[PDB]
């Protein structure tokens, strides 16, 4: 153990982290009168709409 | 003819073509974690401040 042979000394450290996500979203609000266009076999109506509103520059 | 419907039955889809309303409502939440530590520390002496005569080869 003499002239130190076997003094030592050692460190080590590893790090890791990672992290992700996502989020989506959607509202509508409104009133709209529609047609029907269409009576299916089983008494299911499609419906087809437009409103077209003018206001200004637009 | 749509065939016969039930009177007092409640309103289920029976057949190709027919609505149900999906109230999505999802919620779900996992998570783990864990460690581990170990330790050791060991600190020794002896010292022999004042030797009488009949130790002092030893």
């Known amino acids: 153990f003499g002239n130190s042979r076997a003094d030592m000394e050692a460190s080590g ?7 992700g996500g996502a989020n989506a979203s959607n509202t509508f609000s409104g009133t709209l009168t529609v047609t029907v266009d269409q009576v299916l076999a089983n008494g299911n109506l499609h419906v087809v709409g437009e409103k ?3 206001i200004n520059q637009g | 003819n749509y065939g016969y419907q039930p009177l007092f039955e ?4 029976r057949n190709i073509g027919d609505t149900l ?12 974690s864990s460690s581990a530590n170990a330790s ?3 600190k020794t002496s002896f010292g ?3 030797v009488p005569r009949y130790l002092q080869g030893l």
């Not at chain 1, 450290?13 to 992290?19: C, E, L, T, W």
């Not at chain 2, 309303?21 to 783990?32: D, G």
């Open chain 2, 10 to 13: 409640d309103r289920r889809p």
């Open chain 1, 13 to 19: 450290g590893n790090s890791f982290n990672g992290k």
């Open chain 1, 52 to 54: 077209q509103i003018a």
């Open chain 2, 21 to 32: 309303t999906i109230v999505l409502q999802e919620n779900v939440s996992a998570s783990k």
């Open chain 2, 48 to 50: 022999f401040d004042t």
């Open chain 2, 40 to 42: 050791r520390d060991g």
